[PDB]
Symmetry: C4
Subunit: 353 residues, 4 copies
């Protein structure tokens, strides 16, 4: 019985070692955040428009000016290989088959180059900055291998306090490795190559990355640039002012700050203030959750755990199935609310509860 | 112990095969909708008017200008024969004995003509449009056999995602059949009678039925016409503008869109805007639920599952009992709030919580 | 461990036959009302006034111009004899020992005259009108035996639908009797004494008692007259306009209309509009509940089930204990919020939640 | 697994006799207060400021003009010796090692002089007034032994009704004693020394202590004076007007009045009205709770049960661990919301829910 995302979560929990399942499902501290991420969707209900011809529906939509099959993306998640062999590739291929982008994590198990060589879909690269020089290296690598979009994640200045991991003494799977940091020269002495080597032997990332640093990154990357991890219209607006082509409102799936607001709380305001693409993630599980965000102005929704449940439970085919169910779910929802064209969604279909 | 609707639900669950009970009780996806349909009634409480002579009470009321025993109706529900033998007839006869209308579903187990021949009560016909020509045939049949009112259901452009049915692989009971589609010619070739035959061998209904199509139906039917499945004052108003004599606010008992608002949320507004009869259903189980809707301006309330529990548990007699309990419940409620005449109900007896 | 009202409820449930306990504790239909009666008190929290000398506190207060030990009363409850032998007397004597009034129910087990003869405390009489002539007889009897106050209960035009009683086929205890209806002549023929005899062989009360009837009662009774069962400032105000000396806001302990508002919802408004004594009951269990009502303007609070738990569990001594605990509870509360004199309570000590 | 305060509570419950655990964890009456103290923190969520350099963070802050390691203090709690041998000293030494103040209770197990002799940290003295003369004696003793700050607790005019203690017949541990009342002369006759001896053989404190009495105390103590137990901006303001250098908003950890508001409800208003230091306690368990209070204007947060769990579970080392976890928790939180300097916190980082 695999009829929705929750069904895949259940199957994933039965197939994954507890330690890995907890790494995946876990949230920060009391996990009031992940619960809030789900509960906030109940703050809106639908007011369908009847007697509208919905015999011909379209989920096609432009994301950052580029057309794709539906307003969805498989977001960046680390250590996918711990969930399923060659997890990064399975996700990328399923996204490509579905006609949507796949975002590779800086902490992926498959390197930037290897994926680009084995997948011709729309590949995006999510960047974490531990060392400036090293970050510049990955950015150029992504540029040279055909990655269309760069995503800077800004909500991991310090590691989230995930107590499930602490209880399990969670250690990065042995058979896995942070491939993108491979080959990064060693044996060299002096300032960097010592200053740098120190930074990469640390589990902490660059907590000094500020607005000025964003300008630096903006000049380095020539294509579309998005800033991920924002939770205020003000920050979203500043990002646009600094050169970003759009933003991704997100609280990292409730894994960083348990009491952070849900990005849904500032979605409408961010859309109204920035006037630029506002993407979003965190808590999306049902097609209705997605449609509510799109109706509030979201350009697209990125999936985190939803597609990972498919991956963990049934590999690549599992991801295909979750995307198929979600697409049919979105389609069914559009028909029921009387909005045949997904690009016609507006707050007029919602009722604040 | 059969003292209320819930008691009949309990007895129905014990007598019906799980698969059938789930078909009856089930809702869309997470079933947050059916729960909301019940919970929303708690948003209003009563403020009784004391020292009012309620020794003589009346539940009599005009629905669409025609007087009936009480502001209730047994709404249209498909496959009643799966709940109890000749279920459609049992319901119709119980409604007639109670002095209220019965609405026959397009997907009933007893044909339009057979029921009209065996029941002389006020019979209404609920229409689903799968094929225009076929729909026209049923409409004329209902007209020629004495059906007083036509009800167009507009909230099933596509089938609701009811996961209980998916889990049970629910298949339309063998001993049952969609009688109203019987005799519908076959063996014929060319456009329709091939184009048509295709549409009826499909579980999908006409998702293109729009406002223009409603005008078509309006000219075809000479008597009272109601549009069912509306969830906004705006749609209700447009229906009246297009010729409808009234509307039925409804979310199909939470069986189509899990996150749809409860029709109770737009009842007062629809009454104020349309100035025409506004009937309603979805979630009604207690007499207090019904009185609250009537106090907000509802012309009448249609029962869905409430009377079906009586049917499934004890057949025709079961329906009679549920209607008797509900009538006494409404009567008792009117006495307690100090409104002896049901037609005198107003928002003045309610307190928003 | 008998440290509060709940402890006595627990002990009462262990000592009483289930049928009797259910008669006592039960509410109308779903019992959402009794729950609401309790929950509504959480809508207010205390904002204590510190550094106030509370070394000398006083709970003494005038109720209808007459001074009593504390702003409490044991309200009218029927069939007290079913809870404990000579229950009416036990309650009356405990109230008298505590320095507060006791209200005798029309449906008591001890007659109006017998109680007045065995108790010299402040006795009030609660009237139910089944037959006008008979009611007049009890009213005069109460007047001639020294009852100081008359209370007309108006919220039982028809019997509440208490399903626990229906499930238990609850029958008025055999060893008990509605003593106040004793001796009421029989064997006589013609109009009344036939018309009357019919009314008393009925479980229904006079549902026609209206404002005009209240004027009738007002001229019959020369002392303080209160109307009980009101749930709106408007009705309270009309009662005063018709001659009442005060009112008792109440929903009959959630035993008549499950969805009725809690009287706490219209307490402040009734106090402001009538400018006359506004007493109240329904849901009071803790001293804090009582203080909140008094702070909102209530003249006094009548206890229903609270003191009955003491009665059922430990007879007269049980009632004394509950009143002692409640008095100490109120006293302790006054000290903690910084209001040494109970008559100085105001909304200034409360915070709306 | 000791990763947060709750983990220490769990370990403390396993090591402490039930009677003692209940004395510690218990609240007044229904304990709705302690629950509210926790729940109220969910009324605010965080809105992080991204791309802020948080590589260098500081928790250092001035409390009453004096710099300390972080905006925390170990508040005054009685009978610490019942939780762990020499509990008062263990707490004081852990606070000193952490760089924060420790407040000694009037009802401590270690005397004012003994502690000051064995601990050179910042020691504060919390005063309870049972007898004026005796209180004056302790105040001068605290002054002569080096206590920097005096804290008057005003919310125990009468003892809270803690039913857990009543159920357990809780008796002050035998091996323990209210040391600060030791030596207090006896054998003397006449007025005081008889009037006084009577007051100290009583479990009740001076319920007459008012504003005038505060003026008396203000002239007696030359250093910083704080009034603890306030629950309104008005009282806080009056305290400042009467000479206090600051206040401590508090409901005594929900141990005195079950329905008292949480001090968090009047924090912002008290800060705005008084313009003086507003400290606070009651319900703090997570670093996020603390940061929310600081963001609303609180000068510092006092810990009650949080550090006592560390004490009860693992003595002095346990307190050190809880303070270490809380410091790292606060630090981590500051980094995640983008406020590197704790003194820069403002309501701008919060979202009202
Ligand atoms: C197992 C796991 C690993 C993650 N790794 C990363 C990462 O490497 N880079 C990043 O930008 N976000 C990362 N995220 C956050 C996701 O991009 C996304 O914001 C989040 O999962 C959205 O919420 P949801 O899980 O409810 O869909 C991770 C989330 C999970 C559940
Ligand atoms: C078993 C079942 C079958 C239904 N079949 C139909 C149908 O054939 N036509 C229609 O207009 N509505 C149909 N409905 C919806 C009802 O008319 C009605 O809107 C709904 O049951 C009201 O909610 P309630 O069940 O809470 O009373 C059906 C509902 C149930 C429970
Ligand atoms: C067992 C029982 C019998 C009652 N009988 C009467 C009655 O004879 N007359 C009347 O005026 N109210 C009657 N009441 C209502 C009470 O006067 C009072 O309004 C109610 O109990 C208040 O609520 P509480 O039970 O939460 O305190 C009765 C209530 C109970 C619980
Ligand atoms: C076991 C225990 C004993 C206490 N003793 C005292 C005391 O002697 N003096 C005082 O001012 N407050 C006293 N308090 C109240 C604390 O100072 C503080 O207000 C309260 O614990 C804060 O709430 P929290 O426990 O949720 O942190 C006590 C609290 C507890 C839990």
């Amino acid at each position: 019985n695999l009829f929705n995302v929750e069904d895949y979560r259940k199957l994933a929990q039965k197939r994954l070692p507890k330690m890995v399942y907890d790494y995946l499902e876990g949230g920060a501290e009391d996990e009031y955040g992940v619960k809030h991420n789900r509960d906030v969707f109940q703050q809106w209900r639908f007011k369908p428009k009847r007697l509208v011809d919905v015999s011909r529906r379209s989920l096609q939509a432009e994301v950052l000016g580029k057309r794709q099959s539906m307003p969805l993306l498989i977001g960046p998640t680390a250590l996918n290989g711990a969930l399923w062999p060659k997890g990064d590739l399975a996700l990328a291929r399923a996204a490509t088959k579905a006609g949507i982008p796949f975002v590779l994590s800086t902490a992926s198990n498959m390197s930037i180059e290897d994926l680009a060589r084995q997948c011709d879909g729309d590949l995006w690269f999510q960047l974490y900055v531990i060392h400036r020089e090293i970050a510049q290296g990955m950015v150029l690598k992504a540029l040279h291998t055909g990655y269309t979009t760069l995503v800077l994640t800004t909500d991991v200045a310090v590691n989230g306090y995930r107590e499930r991991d602490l209880h399990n003494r969670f250690k990065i799977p042995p058979f896995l490795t942070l491939k993108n940091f491979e080959g990064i020269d060693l044996g060299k002495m002096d300032k960097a190559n010592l200053e740098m080597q120190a930074a990469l032997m640390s589990r902490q990332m660059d907590a000094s990355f500020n607005w000025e640093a964003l300008r630096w990154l903006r000049d380095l990357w020539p294509h579309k640039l998005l800033v991920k991890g924002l939770l205020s219209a003000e920050d979203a607006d500043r990002c646009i002012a600094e050169g970003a082509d759009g933003v991704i409102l997100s609280n990292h799936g409730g894994r960083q700050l348990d009491c952070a607001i849900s990005p849904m709380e500032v979605l409408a305001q961010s859309v109204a203030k920035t006037g630029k693409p506002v993407l979003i993630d965190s808590g999306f599980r049902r097609g209705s959750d997605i449609v509510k965000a799109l109706a509030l102005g979201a350009e697209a929704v990125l999936l985190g755990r939803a597609t990972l449940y498919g991956l963990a439970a049934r590999g690549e085919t599992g991801v295909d199935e979750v995307l198929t169910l979600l697409k049919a779910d979105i389609d069914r929802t559009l028909a029921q609310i009387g909005c045949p064209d997904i690009t016609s969604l507006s707050p007029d279909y919602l009722q604040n509860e």
